[PDB]
């Protein structure tokens, strides 16, 4: 299948409560494999998936050096951005960064990513050409000028096309029994009267991996987008995800409704109905 690696950095100032916290977590697809938290009692890169544990001490020491240095760099960056927006020293602010590489179903680089946000708003992003930047505002234009001067894009491109893909392929092989296994959803439909003339049909998908899935209700073969309550896909805590989609239907019309399920783990998409 298709696979991606992503690192997610969050740097958060907290005036009056010490220096900015830096967290980094690393994912392959929907599986976290490392964390680093500058607030930990003894900050170090820690494994979060069994398949990463076999990496040697040099790997862990190098990761920890990077994240420790990042802890300091992001503190400087937070000060810089406060200044770019003429903000007071009183408020708490957040820089977020997500970056990484996507491979197609043949292990080839599909595209790279390096995007940043400030206080939850797009700030600056490396364009898909891995060569130029898109800055959200005049503040981010300052960062852009700095990064253009420091050959930043060139260095990220090298990473994204090189080490990013190499490592991702290594992880995919080392964790092949899980990372390259798609678990299909276990599905069922439940029925709950809401009154004398209506009932809720709820289509369930449980135990699936990865998280990407499509759950839809049709009435007489027509998608019921507007009338379907779709909850956010949620983690079960055992690596798998859950989702449901509900529709309220006239009593006696239940058989006119069909739930449709698509998931990488399914050769054949599913069509389900309530089975009283």
């Amino acid at each position: 299948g298709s696979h991606s690696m992503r690192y997610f950095y969050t740097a958060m100032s907290r005036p009056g409560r010490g220096e900015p916290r830096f967290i980094a977590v690393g994912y392959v697809d929907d599986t976290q494999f490392v964390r680093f938290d500058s607030d930990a009692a003894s900050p170090r890169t820690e494994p979060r998936a069994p398949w990463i544990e076999q990496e040697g001490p040099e790997y862990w020491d190098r990761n920890t050096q990077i994240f420790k240095t990042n802890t300091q760099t992001y503190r400087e960056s937070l000060r810089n951005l406060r200044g770019y927006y003429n903000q007071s020293e009183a408020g708490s602010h957040i820089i977020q960064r997500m970056y990484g590489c996507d491979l197609g179903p043949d292990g080839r680089l599909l595209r790279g990513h390096d995007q940043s946000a400030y206080d939850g708003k797009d700030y600056i992003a490396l364009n898909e050409d891995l060569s130029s930047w898109t800055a959200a505002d005049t503040a981010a234009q300052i960062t852009q000028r700095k990064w253009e001067a420091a050959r930043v894009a060139e260095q990220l491109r090298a990473y994204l096309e090189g080490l990013c893909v190499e490592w991702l392929r290594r992880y995919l092989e080392n964790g092949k029994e899980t990372l390259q296994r798609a678990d299909p959803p276990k599905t069922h439909v439940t029925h709950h009267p809401v009154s004398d003339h209506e009932a809720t049909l709820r289509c369930w998908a449980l135990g699936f991996y990865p998280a990407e899935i499509t759950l839809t209700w049709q009435r007489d073969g027509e998608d019921q987008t507007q009338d379907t309550e779709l909850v956010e896909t949620r983690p079960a805590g055992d690596r798998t995800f859950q989702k449901w989609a509900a529709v309220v239907v006239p009593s006696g019309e239940e058989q006119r409704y069909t739930c449709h399920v698509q998931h990488e783990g399914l050769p054949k998409p599913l069509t389900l109905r309530w089975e009283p």
Binding site: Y7, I66, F67, T69, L163
Partner: peptide, 11 residues
């Protein structure tokens, strides 16, 4: 493995 950009990625 993360990128080692700590020495140049100051915003």
């Amino acid at each position: 493995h993360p990128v080692g950009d700590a020495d140049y990625f100051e915003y």
